[PDB]
Amino acid sequence: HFEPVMEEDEEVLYKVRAKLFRFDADAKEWKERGTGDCKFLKNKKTNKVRILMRRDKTLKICANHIIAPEYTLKPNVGSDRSWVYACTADIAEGEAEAFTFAIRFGSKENADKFKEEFEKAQEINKKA
Amino acid sequence: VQFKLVLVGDGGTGKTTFVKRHLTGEFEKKYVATLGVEVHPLVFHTNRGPIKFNVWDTAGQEKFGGLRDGYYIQAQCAIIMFDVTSRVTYKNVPNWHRDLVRVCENIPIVLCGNKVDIKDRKVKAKSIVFHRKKNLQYYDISAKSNYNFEKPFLWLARKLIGDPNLEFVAMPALAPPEVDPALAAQYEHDLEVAQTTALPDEDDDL
Amino acid sequence: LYLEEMVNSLL
Amino acid sequence: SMEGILDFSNDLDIALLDQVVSTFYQGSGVQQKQAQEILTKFQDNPDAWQKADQILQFSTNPQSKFIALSILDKLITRKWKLLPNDHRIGIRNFVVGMIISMCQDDEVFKTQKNLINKSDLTLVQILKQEWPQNWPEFIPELIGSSSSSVNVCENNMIVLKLLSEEVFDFSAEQMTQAKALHLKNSMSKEFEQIFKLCFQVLEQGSSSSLIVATLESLLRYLHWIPYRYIYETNILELLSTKFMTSPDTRAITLKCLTEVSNLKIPQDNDLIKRQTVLFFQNTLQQIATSVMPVTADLKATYANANGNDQSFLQDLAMFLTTYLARNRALLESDESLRELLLNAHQYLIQLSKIEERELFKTTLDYWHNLVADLFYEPLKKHIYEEICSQLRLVIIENMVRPEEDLVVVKESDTIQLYKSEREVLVYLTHLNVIDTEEIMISKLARQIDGSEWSWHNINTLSWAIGSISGTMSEDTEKRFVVTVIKDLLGLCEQKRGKDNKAVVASDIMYVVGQYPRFLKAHWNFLRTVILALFEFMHETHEGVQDMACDTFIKIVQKCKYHFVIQQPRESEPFIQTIIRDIQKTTADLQPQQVHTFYKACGIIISEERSVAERNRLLSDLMQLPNMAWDTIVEQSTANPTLLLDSETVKIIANIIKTNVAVCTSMGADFYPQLGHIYYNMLQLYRAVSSMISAQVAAEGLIATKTPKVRGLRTIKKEILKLVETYISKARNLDDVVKVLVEPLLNAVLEDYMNNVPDARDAEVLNCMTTVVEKVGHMIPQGVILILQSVFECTLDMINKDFTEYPEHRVEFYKLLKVINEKSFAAFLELPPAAFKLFVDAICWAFKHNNRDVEVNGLQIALDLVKNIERMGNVPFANEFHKNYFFIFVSETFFVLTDSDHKSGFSKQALLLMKLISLVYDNKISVPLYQEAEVPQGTSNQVYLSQYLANMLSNAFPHLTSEQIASFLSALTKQCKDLVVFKGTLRDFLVQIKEVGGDPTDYLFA
Ligand SMILES: Nc1nc2c(ncn2[C@@H]2O[C@H](COP(=O)(O)OP(=O)(O)NP(=O)(O)O)[C@@H](O)[C@H]2O)c(=O)[nH]1
Ligand SMILES: [Mg+2]
Known part of the structure; x- marks a missing residue:
C-alpha cells in the first residue's frame, strides 16, 4: 500500500442577460446598477423564488429580493424591451432598502419572456 | 486587510468615472472635475478573503490639484490613467509617473489607457511602450463598455497579497426578506416619474 | 451537414 | 474647530496642524474630507510659506513637514525672484541645514525617507534658481561632505540623481530653452568631479544602500554623459560582474547596462567593439551562474511571481533585446563568440514562453528585427536555424485571435498583436518553409489524437495556418491546404455535440477564407465552399x-x-x-x-x-426589397397611420438598409437602383418628418425617446446615409447636380430648420457636407440655401455650453470647413451680422477641448485668412482685417496661454504665425488702427507691436515690460520659421508661470 500525495440550496427557474437600473429620484435620473445574468432562484426548503443578479467579472450582487406577488411590471416610455417596477426590500448592498428598478434585455422577445417567468414565479410565491 | 491606492492622470481621462463604475455600477456621462482628492473604500471578494482598497481619486486638472504629490504619501499601489483618444494625456504619463515614484519608490503600478470604446483611437497600441522599462502593468480599458475594467484591481490584488492565483469569487447571497398601505400613493408617484424618464443608451446591446 | 460533399470535392 | 490653522493673525498651533494632517491621512469619511479641504486652503494661502520654517522645526509629524515643503516648492518655482534677497538666503540655509541634520541622525535617516527625498527635491528646486551663478561651491562642497559620512554621501547621490533628472530628463517642458542649456552646460562642466566620486564609491564597495543609490544616479547620467566616461574607465567591468552577483544591485545594474547599450559610440574603434562584447559576455556569465541557467523554465518562474523575479525577467528581456538589436553582428563572425550569441537568444526563447502579454510584445518586437534581417542579410540565417525552429513553435502556440474569427467586443490590442505575430511567422516561413509545414502538420496530428485537443488549441493552430498564406509555392500550398482541410473535416466528424462541431467548422471556414489563391484555381471546390456556408x-x-x-x-x-x-x-x-x-x-x-x-x-x-x-x-x-418597397409606398401613402405601425417602420428601415449595403459595394454603379426609389424615398422622408413633428406636438419632447419616433428617425437617417453613400462615390456629377440635389435640399433643409432642436437630425449636416464636398463648386445657390437653413439655428444649439448636442457640434464645423474650402463665395453673400456670427462660431470652436471641434475650428480660421488674402486689395478684405484681424490674434493668443488647450498648440502657433506674417509682409493694405488713436503714417508693424504689448501687459500683469518687448521682438522676427516660432511660444508659456523671467531668454534662437 502506497500512500497517495449562497445559492447552493436553490433551483434555477430562469436565467437571462440583462442590465439593471435604479432610479435616483433626487436627480430624476436612471443610473446603471449592474450588467450580468439575472436568475430566478427557487429555494428547495421554502419554495420561495427570488431574483439574484451578479455583475460580470466582479460577480458582485446588484439585485437580491423576493419576486413579491404585489409587484407589477410596467413599461418604460423609451423602451419596448424593459420593465419598471418598485421593490420594497433589496439586499444587494447590505441593509434592506427600497428601490424603483428598471431592467433591460437584449430583445423585446427576452423582455416578454422575462415578464411571464416573472409572473409564473409571482404565483409560486403566492401559494407558499 | 486594506491597501491605499492612488489614482493619477490628466483631467478628463476617466479616473472618477472608472472608480464610480466599480463603486455603484453606474456610468457617469458628465465631466465634473475632481477637486483635490476623493477617497472611497472599494472591497473585492477573492478566494483569499476580502481585499479592501482605499482609493484616493486625485484631481488631474492643475488648477484643482490640491496637495498634489502630498496625496501619494504611504500609498501601497497606484493606477496611472490616460485617454487613448487624447495624445497629450499619454505624453504626460511620464510626468505623473515621475511625481508618483519619487514619493512611492517600490509599489505595484498599473498603467491604463481608457476610452478604448471610442472608434477614432489616437494613441495606437504600438505607441504605448512607457510601461516596459518602468515595470508597470498595462491594460487597455473602457469604463463605458467595461472592457478589462476589473483587470487593474485583480492584478494589484495578486501583487499585494503575494498570490499569483488569487481570483475574484462570488460574494455570498443571503436569502432576501419578505415584504405598507400608508405609502401606496407615495410609491405610485415615484413610479410614474420613473416610467416617464427614459432609460439611457437605448441603442446599446444591453 | 453538407460538409460531406466538401470531403469528396477535395479528394 | 479644525479650521483654526487657517487664521494667520494668530500663531500657528503645530499640534492643531498635526491633528488636521492625521485626520486626513489616517482618518476616514466626513472628518477626512473636512481636513482635506482645510489642508488645501492652508497650503494655498500665499503666506503659508512663511510658516514652513516653523513647521519644519517644531512639528513631529512627517506628513506635516512634507506639506510644508510642498508649500516651499510652490514659492521657489513660481515666486522665488520676487522675494527680498534675505528670504532667498534664509530659505536656502534652513533647507540645507534640515537635510544635514536628518542625515546625521541614523534613526531619522532610516525611518523618514519620504521626507528626506522631498527635502532633496526642494533643494534641487533652489539649485535650478541659484546654481551655479550664485552657488559655485555647491559641487566641490558636495564632494567634500560625502567623505565625512556614509549617510551624507548616499543622500548626495539622491540629490545628484534628482538634479540630473530635472536638468536633462524633464527640462524640455518646464524651463526656457536658454535656462535648460545653461543648466546642462553647468552640469557638464563639473561632471568630471561628480564621476570621480561616483566611481570611487562603486569601486571601494561599502553600504549596499549607498551602492544602490550611486547606481541609480549613474542610470540618469547615462542619458547624456559622453561615452568616454563609460569606455575609458573600469566601470563596465564593475557593472557587468561585481554588481550583477548581488541581487541588491542587480536590478539597477541591468538597467544601467541597457542604457549603456544605447550610448553614442564610434563604430570604427576595434577596442571599443571588444569592450562592448566583453560586458555582454560578463553579464550573461553572471546570469548563468548566479541567477539561472539557459535551460531554466522562465515561464514557470514568472508565473510563481516570487520576490522581484517578474521585474528582473522584464529587465533581462529589455537588456537582451536592446543589446542584440544593436550589436549582435559583433558576435556573428567570431567563432569563439557563437556560444554567447546563441545562449543570449536561447534566454530570449525562454523569455518568449512567459504568459505576459506586454512582455511577449517586447520579445516579439525583437524577433521581428531578427527575422527581417535574416531574410535580407546574406549568410546570416544559417547561424540561427535552431533558434528560428524553436521560435516557430512559440509563435504558432501563442497565436491570438485575428479580426476574422468572431466565434468565441472587438479587441484592438489583440488585433495589433496578431498582425505582429503574422509578420514574424511569415518571415520564419520564408526562412524555412519545410520546417514550418512539418510543425503545423505535427501540431494538427496531436489535435486528432486528442493529446492536445481543446477549443483554444485548435483555434490557435488554425489562426497560425491561416496567417502564413502567401508564403508557400502554389503546389506546396495546394498539398498543404488539402491535408489541413482533410484533417480538419475528419476532426469535425470525430467530435459529437454541436459546440465541438461548431468550433471546428468555424476554424475550417477561417482557413479556407485565408487561402483565396487555392479557391481561385479550384472552382468546383470554391463552389462547394459557398454552398456549405449557405447551409450554415x-x-x-x-x-x-x-x-x-x-x-x-x-x-x-x-x-x-x-x-x-x-x-x-x-x-x-x-x-x-x-x-x-x-x-x-x-x-x-x-x-x-x-x-x-x-x-x-x-x-x-x-x-x-x-x-x-x-x-x-x-x-x-434588388427584386425582393423593391417589391416590398413598391407595396409600402402604395400602402404607407394611402393610410399614413401605418408608419405608426412599428412592423411597417421596421420593414421600411430594413429595405433602406439593404439599399445602403448594396450601394456601399457598388458606388457609382448603384445609380439605376437609386433612381428607381429616389423620388418616392424623399416623399417618404417628408411623410416620416410630419409624423415625428406631429408626435412631438402631441406628446412633448419625451416623444423623441419612444421606440416609435426612434424608429421613424431611423428611416430618415438611413435615407440620408443612402444618399450620402452614393454621392460620395458618384462619377457622373452632372446627374448628381441636375437630378439628385434639388429634390434632396427641398426634402431636408426646411424640415431641419423648422424642427425644435431635439428633433433635428445631425445626419442632415453630415449629408450636406458630402454634397458640398463633391459638387459644391457646381451649386453656389444650393450652398447658400444650406447655410441659410442650418447655420444660425445650429449655432444657437451649440453656443451655450460645450456639451449639449455633441454630434451637431462636430458635424456643424465639418460643414462650415468644407463650405469655406469649396464655396467661400457663400460666406461673402452673408449679411454682415451673419458673417459676424461666422467669426464668433470659429473662435467658439477654438475654445473646445473636444479635438473633433478644436482642430476644425483652427483650420477654418487658417483657411479663412487665406481665402481673404487671395482676394487682394478689395473692400471686403480690407473691412475683414479692420473688423476681425485683432479678434483672431487675441482669441488665438488666449487659447495658447490659458493652459486648457494644449492639444491644439501646433495649429494655434501656425495660425498665429500666419496672422503676424501678414503684417510683416505688408499683406494688409489699410491701417489696422483708428485714424485718431495713432499718428498718421504709422506702420501696421508698429501698431501690432503696441497692441500686443498692451494686450499682454493687461493679461499677464506680473511680466515686466522688458519681458513682453523681448518676447514680441523675437516672435515677430521668427514668423517665417515655425519650429523657432513655436520654441519662443513655449518659452513664453514657461515664463508666465513664474515671476522674474529673463528677457534675454528670447534671444536663444
Ligand atoms: N466614451 C468614454 N467616456 C468615458 C470613459 N470614461 C470616462 N468617460 C467620460 O470622460 C469624462 C471625464 O470623466 P472623469 O471621470 O470625470 O475624468 P477625471 O479623470 O476624473 N477628471 P479629473 O481629474 O479632473 O477629476 C466623462 O464625461 C466620462 O463620462 C470611457 O471609458 N469611455
Ligand atoms: Mg475626477
Missing part, C-alpha cells in the same frame, strides 16, 4: 450564421471574378444562382446578416463591366 446560414447555433456570412463576403472580396464569369461546366455565372435562391438562402438570417449578404452580392455585380448585364443583375438582386 440556416444553422441556429450561436455564431454559426455570423461566421458563415463574414466568410462569404471575405471570400467574395478576394474571388469576385470567379462569380461573375461563366465557369467551364456551368450554364450561368454563379452570381445568378446566388440571386435566384437568395430568399431561401437568407430566410433564417437576422437583418444585419441579410444586408451583409446583399453587400457581398454587390461586390460581385460591380465586377461585371457590361452595363446592361450589370444593371440587370442589380435589378434581380
